[PDB]
Amino acid sequence: IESGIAHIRSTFNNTIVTITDTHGNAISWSSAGALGFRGSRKSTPFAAQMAAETAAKGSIEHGLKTLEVTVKGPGSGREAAIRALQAAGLEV
């Protein structure tokens, strides 16, 4: 499938990135915690960035191209995590 949503949940503790089809079926996901970041690091935008990349590169295998993005939560990740989706190749 080509088109999909990137659900970014940036909390103060963690940044999760799920990528789904339009029907909200999960394609792939990654989180700061899933990349082995711990404590302060998970909060940081860099971790959000890397989480977005890992979630994205999982999606590109299934063959995505365009992403709608949804952001939740007050974390600092959303700006970094979205750039990372653009940087991974998927158009926002």
* Candidate residues 14, 27, 37, 82; the one interacting with other proteins per rule CB under 8 A: 37
Q: Cα(80)–Cα(47) distance, rounded to whole angstroms?
A: 9
Alpha helix locations (H) across 1-92?
Answer: 40-43, 45-62, 77-87
What three-state secondary structure class fits 8? strand
Q: Hey, what are 89's tokens?
A: 């190749």
**Range 6-25, binding other proteins (CB under 8 A):** none
* Candidate residues 5, 11, 21, 46; the one interacting with other proteins per rule CB under 8 A: 46
Point out which span in 1-9, 12-20, 58-66, 68-76 binds other proteins (CB under 8 A): 58-66
Least distance CB 46 / other proteins (angstroms): 6
**Contact set with other proteins (CB under 8 A):** 28, 30, 34-38, 41, 46, 50, 53-54, 57-58, 60-61, 87
